[PDB]
Structures are given as C-alpha cells and as structure tokens.
Design an enzyme around this catalytic site. Structure first.
Site, PDB file in Angstrom:
ATOM      1  N   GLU A  27       0.809  -1.131   0.048  1.00 40.61           N
ATOM      2  CA  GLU A  27      -0.180   0.172  -0.093  1.00 40.61           C
ATOM      3  C   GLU A  27       0.866   1.147  -0.052  1.00 40.61           C
ATOM      4  O   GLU A  27       0.636   2.278  -0.822  1.00 40.61           O
ATOM      5  CB  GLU A  27      -0.870  -0.052   1.250  1.00 40.61           C
ATOM      6  CG  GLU A  27      -1.955   1.363   1.152  1.00 40.61           C
ATOM      7  CD  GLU A  27      -2.696   1.722  -0.070  1.00 40.61           C
ATOM      8  OE1 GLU A  27      -2.947   0.684  -0.645  1.00 40.61           O
ATOM      9  OE2 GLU A  27      -2.566   2.834  -0.113  1.00 40.61           O
ATOM     10  N   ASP A  58      10.790   7.830  -1.427  1.00 37.85           N
ATOM     11  CA  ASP A  58      11.129   8.319  -2.763  1.00 37.85           C
ATOM     12  C   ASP A  58      11.819   9.646  -2.921  1.00 37.85           C
ATOM     13  O   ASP A  58      11.782  10.454  -1.803  1.00 37.85           O
ATOM     14  CB  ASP A  58       9.730   8.229  -3.379  1.00 37.85           C
ATOM     15  CG  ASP A  58       8.513   9.278  -2.967  1.00 37.85           C
ATOM     16  OD1 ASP A  58       8.886  10.557  -3.168  1.00 37.85           O
ATOM     17  OD2 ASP A  58       7.539   8.734  -2.411  1.00 37.85           O
ATOM     18  N   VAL A  82      -7.197  10.614   7.415  1.00 34.78           N
ATOM     19  CA  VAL A  82      -8.605  10.606   6.719  1.00 34.78           C
ATOM     20  C   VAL A  82      -8.614   9.445   5.892  1.00 34.78           C
ATOM     21  O   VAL A  82      -7.821   9.303   5.036  1.00 34.78           O
ATOM     22  CB  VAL A  82      -9.022  11.991   6.181  1.00 34.78           C
ATOM     23  CG1 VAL A  82     -10.409  11.817   5.437  1.00 34.78           C
ATOM     24  CG2 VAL A  82      -8.834  13.006   7.278  1.00 34.78           C
ATOM     25  N   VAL A  85      -6.214   1.292  -0.837  1.00 34.94           N
ATOM     26  CA  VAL A  85      -7.041   1.298   0.455  1.00 34.94           C
ATOM     27  C   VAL A  85      -6.400   2.763   1.190  1.00 34.94           C
ATOM     28  O   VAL A  85      -7.251   2.997   2.083  1.00 34.94           O
ATOM     29  CB  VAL A  85      -6.747   0.395   1.351  1.00 34.94           C
ATOM     30  CG1 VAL A  85      -7.470  -1.182   0.585  1.00 34.94           C
ATOM     31  CG2 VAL A  85      -5.416   0.213   1.784  1.00 34.94           C
ATOM     32  N   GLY A  86      -5.419   3.324   0.715  1.00 35.04           N
ATOM     33  CA  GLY A  86      -4.799   4.746   1.340  1.00 35.04           C
ATOM     34  C   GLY A  86      -3.735   4.236   2.277  1.00 35.04           C
ATOM     35  O   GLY A  86      -3.761   3.480   3.048  1.00 35.04           O
ATOM     36  N   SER A  88      -3.453   6.057   4.948  1.00 34.03           N
ATOM     37  CA  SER A  88      -4.195   6.112   6.126  1.00 34.03           C
ATOM     38  C   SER A  88      -4.589   4.811   7.106  1.00 34.03           C
ATOM     39  O   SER A  88      -4.492   4.867   8.253  1.00 34.03           O
ATOM     40  CB  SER A  88      -5.605   6.935   6.197  1.00 34.03           C
ATOM     41  OG  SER A  88      -6.205   6.407   5.347  1.00 34.03           O
TER      42      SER A  88
HETATM   43  O1  LIG Z   1       4.945   9.564  -1.986  1.00 33.21           O
HETATM   44  C1  LIG Z   1       4.473   8.955  -0.985  1.00 33.21           C
HETATM   45  C2  LIG Z   1       5.366   8.049  -0.317  1.00 33.21           C
HETATM   46  C3  LIG Z   1       4.581   7.347   0.964  1.00 33.21           C
HETATM   47  C4  LIG Z   1       3.367   7.433   1.059  1.00 33.21           C
HETATM   48  C5  LIG Z   1       2.524   8.228   0.165  1.00 33.21           C
HETATM   49  C6  LIG Z   1       3.154   9.049  -0.678  1.00 33.21           C
HETATM   50 CL1  LIG Z   1       2.083  10.158  -1.562  1.00 33.21          CL
END
Ligand SMILES: Oc1ccccc1Cl
Ligand SMILES: Nc1nc2ccccc2[nH]1
Ligand SMILES: Oc1ccccc1Cl
Lengths: 188, 184
Positions: A27, A58, A82, A85-86, A88
């Site tokens: 995720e 990254d 919030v 699946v996200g 979060s």
């Molecule tokens: O670039 C990232 C890295 C981890 C989680 C969410 C984002 Cl947007």
C-alpha cells in the site's frame, strides 16, 4: 480512522496469515510509485530494518505540507488520518509511523502512534533534495501469528511492479542479512 | 475519538501531575450520578482495584442498549464512542469494561483505547438493573502520577454527596482495604 481500527481485516486483509502484513508495505509502495512515475527519473527504496519496521523512500515532489483550510492541519496529516486502500489504513494499523517530507528546501518531520499524531508536522531543517519517507512498525496488537517480513514476498512483487512502471528505479534492502536487489525497467 | 487522542490534556486535564488521571473517575461518576438522580434511592460504588483500574457501579435503569437508528450500533456504543463525557474516558483508557443490566438481561462490551472489540452482547439474565464501567487508564497518556490516590477521590465524592442528597456514594480501596460511605 476508528472504522479501520474496529474491523482491520476489512481494509488490510487477513491479519493472521501474513498476507495483510505484506499488504501494508505494498500500500505504501503503491503511493510512492504513483509519485515516482509522475516525476522524471525517480527512485524508490524499500528497506526492511532489523527491528522489523519497513521504510519506503522516494525522491519525488514530497507530500503537500501546507495547512488544509477546512481540516486546520497539514495536508500530509489529512492524508495520514482521513479514510487502493490509502496510506491512512497503514498508519491506523501501525504502532509507530515516522513521516519525513523534503519539499521547498525544508525537512518536515512527524511521528504517529496507532494513527494518532504525536505533534503537528514540523519543519526541522533544510535540504536541497525532495521526497517522502514513510517508516512504519506494524501493530503487534493487530498483526498476530505472522509478524516478520519475508524478503521474497517483497522482492517478487517489486520485480513485477518494475515492468509496469518504466523509468522508475526500485531498490530493495534487507538490513537483517544485508541482501539487496535493484529493479529498473527502462522500456517504452 | 481521534480528536481526544490527539490532545488528551485539552479534554481531561493535565496528564502528568495526576489531575487528568483523577478527572477520568469524576467524569464516569458524573454520568452515574446523572443517571441516578433521575431516580430515587440509588447508590453508586466507586472501587479502586489492585491492578490500578477503577470501577463505577450504579443501580440505575442502565444505559439504553437498543440499536441507535442513525448510527447502526447500540446506543451504549454511541455514548462510549461519540463526543466532556465517558467517551473521553474510553478514548484514554487502554481497557474499558462496560456491563449494563436492563430489561431482564446482562449486556457486556469491551473496549481497548476506545475501540470496541465486539458489539454489545447479551451474556445472561438478571433481576437487577444498573450500569458498571471499569477502566484501566492508558499509561501511554498518563505519566508520572499513574496510581490513584484515595483521598483525591474521597474529597470530590464527599462534595458530590452533599450536592446530590438522595444518592448514596461508597468508595472502596482494594489495595489497602480502606473504605468510606458518603450519604447526606
Ligand atoms: O510519495 C508518498 C510516499 C509514501 C506514502 C505516500 C506518498 Cl504520496
Ligand atoms: N497501544 C495502543 N493501541 C491503540 C489503538 C488505538 C489508539 C491508541 C492505541 N494505543
Ligand atoms: O450510569 C452510568 C451511565 C454512563 C456511564 C457510566 C455509568 Cl455508571
């Protein structure tokens, strides 16, 4: 996040057999890849740490850090708190999560525990680089039976992902035994 | 409940000097008294347990157990999970046990850090009525002063007994066997 905490299995998958545990990594990887593919010659680094946490870095633009007008907290915190699946969901089911965003010449840091921010997103320093680092410790209250990351489950998935994400460098590192891989498909 | 978890001090009070810790008990007692002051010869029992939990029992009508038409869960769960209130106490308790005796049935539910472990469930029959909440304060939130001082509770419960003249209030310490009975 209380909906996720009430029924973790609905959002992450099976929390006993280890499938849900690895979905936590995938995720975060999906969000990091989404960012990395949008940039030029970006790189993600997935590291399995000796304390059985996993970090995903990254070198993209960084999660937005400005205050959300409605919510009254950083855009990063809104994304983390919030309800793919996200991220979060990963935050909610992690006993600890460390967020580090490099953006607009500034290092931003924030710590969560079980989805709860310990302080507001804070500018702690300066940087020439850009990117997002999420390191999470899976909650041992949620994830039972299988609680350790198998290198081959991550390595296999990241290799498959490399071919769907051209120009994205994907590095995998295991700090437990020193094993490492580099997947970088340059097609199209 | 995440708003409460994010800034516990703003809802319960200072979480380092023991102020907030004892306010957790007083918040539960307020609800128990509220309930019990809607009736007549009711009694509340506050017990300090050996494992550093506190239980508040009342012999009132019991918190409503039926499904809340808007929320889709028991009315008791809505009270424990929606926004000071016992929801705050639930949010800042590493464990909370709820036992409701109402309409001939015993109902039980367990929470951990405000998260229900299962739906409110009928576990038996009973002739009695009332509500019992036992909570274990979260040691992640409450630091330095982590143990309940008897006299801090005794002082406040005494003040409440005068104000709520009809209500009997018992305080019991299972650590050293100390007890009191406040009734005006
Ligand atoms: O670039 C990232 C890295 C981890 C989680 C969410 C984002 Cl947007
Ligand atoms: N240990 C622990 N588990 C938690 C679950 C939800 C919120 C805070 C929590 N602290
Ligand atoms: O009588 C009640 C009601 C709400 C919370 C606790 C008790 Cl003991």
């Amino acid at each position: 996040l209380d909906a996720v905490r009430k029924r973790p299995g609905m959002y992450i998958g099976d929390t006993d057999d280890g499938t849900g545990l690895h979905h936590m990594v995938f995720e975060v990887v999906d969000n990091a890849i989404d960012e990395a593919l949008a940039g030029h010659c970006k790189e993600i680094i997935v590291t399995i740490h000796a304390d059985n946490s996993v970090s995903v870095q990254d070198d993209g633009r960084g999660i937005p850090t400005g205050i959300h007008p409605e919510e009254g907290v950083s855009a990063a915190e809104v994304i983390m708190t919030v309800l793919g699946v996200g991220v979060s969901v990963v935050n909610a089911l992690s006993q600890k999560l460390e967020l580090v965003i490099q953006r607009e010449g500034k290092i931003h840091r924030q710590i969560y525990e079980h989805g709860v921010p310990q302080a507001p997103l804070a500018v702690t320093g300066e940087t020439e680089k850009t990117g997002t680092m999420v390191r999470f410790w899976p909650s041992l209250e949620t994830f039972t039976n299988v609680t350790e990351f198998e290198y081959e489950i991550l390595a296999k998935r990241l290799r498959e992902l490399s071919f769907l994400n051209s120009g994205v460098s994907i590095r995998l590192r295991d700090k437990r035994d020193g094993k490492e891989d580099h997947f970088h498909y340059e097609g199209g």
